[PDB]
Amino acid sequence: GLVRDIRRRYPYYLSDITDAFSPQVLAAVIFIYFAALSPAITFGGLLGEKTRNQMGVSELLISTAVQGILFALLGAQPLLVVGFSGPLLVFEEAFFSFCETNGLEYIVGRVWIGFWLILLVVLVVAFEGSFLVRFISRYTQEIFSFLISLIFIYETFSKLIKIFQDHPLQKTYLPNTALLSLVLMAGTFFFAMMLRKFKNSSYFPGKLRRVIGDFGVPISILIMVLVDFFIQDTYTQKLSVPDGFKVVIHPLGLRSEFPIWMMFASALPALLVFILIFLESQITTLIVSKPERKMVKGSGFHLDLLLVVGMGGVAALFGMPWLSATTVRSVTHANALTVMIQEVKEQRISGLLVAVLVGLSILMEPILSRIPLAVLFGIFLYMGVTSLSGIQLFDRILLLFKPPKYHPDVPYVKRVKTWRMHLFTGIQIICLAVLWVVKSTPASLALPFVLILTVPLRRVLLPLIFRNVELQCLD
């Protein structure tokens, strides 16, 4: 049944290499290269500390690169960018702690989770899995990507204020750096924003303006990096890449004798992981390829599940981390790569290149060593607010703080609901609250259930409140 998508995309495929020779493409490549590499580094590092180096940076780098290349080539949706995520980290930590508590060879039990993943995928794919996906409404997607964008923005700010804690303002004896980090970030962000507006505002002529504005992000990055460069007397945290790659697993163990019962029972955690990757990647493909964006061509749900989680299983076998399709990263790779609304350029080459690049960052170390984190904090913040764009829920939250004097494209929605819209959006908000407290705990792994629990349940208890004309126009 997946075939529908292969048939959809493979003809477009041999066209998508020619589609890629634009400059906007190149700018996008640089932008997304950093947007993918920074979390690869950071998450890799966390992943190493948690697992005491059994599953480390270079593993995540390799996996991200290879998986990236492969999916880029064979995917139904080459705009999707595959990388590690927070949830996946939470689970790695969990499963490691458990495994080692019970004295299980962590990496092996990992492998078995992988086998189970391969199986589950073959099943759910061959038997119409994505069917369920067609029941994922906007009321879901918006709560989801707004929750994410919000968490993302929040996280970025937390990193900055961490720098402030590591080096507080005081006298003697560390100093002068917190401020400069702040400055660098603020500056980078400001320049990104400015260049964007420049790209869409009157000044300057044609290709010069559109190209300068398309390279908004890389130009910003460059400028601020030069600023840090010429400022030589004050320490700044910079991107750190391992000097060189370091660290097939035998499913019966390496230092064990891996218990047979557990190499059955790894089925449950493989269930949880499968649910995570499924939820994320699927909702993500939904938001990237929604009708509101001009891209309504060459995209499919089935191929991507098989590819992503399959890669995942194999990776698990090679002592690599499995990856899902990221929301924010993919969204911003789409916007990159987007003309204004106007058609979006659909490449296999953008993704291919950010992947390869992520791979070779090892070699790129001397370059990347000059790039101050603060700068990329700025870029992050920019991605955060940019990610906030196409979300109607956001539009409405805003619309609440706005006087009732201003109206939407659709008179129906505000006129029928001058109070009630705020209530509907209010339910959105309270859902957001719930999911934010759930995800707040180390109970957070429960979330992908809660997210469904909340929405398609709400989305049945909602017709209790308003009607098939009323509610219908809200998505």
Epitope: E49, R52, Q54, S97, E100, T101, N102, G103, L104, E105, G253, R255, S256, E257, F258, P259, W261, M262
Partner: antibody, heavy 123, light 112 residues
Framework: EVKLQESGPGKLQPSQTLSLTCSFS??????????VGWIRQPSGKGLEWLAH???????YYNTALKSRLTISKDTSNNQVFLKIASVDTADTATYYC???????????????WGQGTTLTVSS | DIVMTQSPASLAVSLGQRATISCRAS??????????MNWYQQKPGQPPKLLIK???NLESGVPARFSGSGSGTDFTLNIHPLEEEDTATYYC?????????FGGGTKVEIKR
């Protein structure tokens, strides 16, 4: 009252199979995070870890020695056992049964030690 | 697998003085926040006894004249003020990965 008690054959002919027994009390080998195993000290030397087994029945073995080692457990009678195949005179040592603890910050350290049992391999 | 090198092999130290023992690891054995190094005391004719876990954390009941420190690949045990009963062999071991291994031990003897 956490106790560990080693028992062995005292002495053993070369080429034969050593069977060691550890009996314990004051804790269960059903409890998560706890492992029981063996470390040996050759006469006038330091310490060599042999093997350990957890409630999972997963069992870690010392490389190089792995092949000659088999560890098992009788949880219901608070015992663990170690077998060493084709024993040689280099296996003459004191064999300690020690409890392993899963550290608050991960990892393990040896919590309680039996008084040990002396083994001599000689014709 | 991790190899550990203790030094000195033997140490003779006057009563009430400071005994200091070091244990080098063949690779790092610590995270950003914890170090996984243990210290044991074995008096002659006795089993080893746990003194220190996590490089510097005194195991309950262990005398405060014992103290541990270090990080990365380099670790240090201190006994001050040294007492008569402290004459013993002292062992370090890592808990970074399986197989757990021990250092070769340091015999601390009293000078009289």
């Amino acid at each position: 009252e956490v106790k560990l008690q080693e028992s062995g054959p005292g002495k053993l002919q070369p080429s034969q199979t050593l069977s060691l027994t550890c009996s314990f009390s004051g804790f269960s080998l059903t409890t998560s995070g706890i492992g029981v195993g063996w470390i040996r000290q050759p006469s006038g030397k330091g310490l060599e870890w042999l093997a350990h087994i957890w409630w999972s029945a997963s069992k870690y073995y010392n490389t190089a020695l792995k092949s000659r080692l088999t560890i098992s457990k009788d949880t219901s009678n608070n015992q663990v056992f170690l077998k060493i195949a084709s024993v040689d005179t280099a296996d003459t040592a004191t064999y300690y049964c020690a409890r392993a603890y899963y550290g608050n910050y991960g990892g393990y350290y040896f919590d309680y030690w039996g008084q040990g049992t002396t083994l001599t391999v000689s014709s | 697998d991790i190899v550990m090198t203790q030094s000195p092999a033997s140490l003779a130290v006057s009563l009430g003085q400071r005994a200091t023992i070091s244990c080098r690891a063949s690779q790092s054995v610590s995270t950003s926040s914890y170090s996984y190094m243990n210290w044991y005391q074995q008096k002659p004719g006795q089993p080893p006894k746990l003194l220190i876990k996590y490089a510097s954390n005194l195991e309950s009941g262990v005398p405060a004249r014992f103290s541990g420190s270090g990080s990365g690949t380099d670790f240090t045990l201190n006994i001050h003020p040294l007492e008569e009963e402290d004459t013993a062999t002292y062992y370090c071991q890592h808990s970074w990965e399986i197989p757990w291994t021990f250092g070769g031990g340091t015999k601390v003897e009293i000078k009289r």
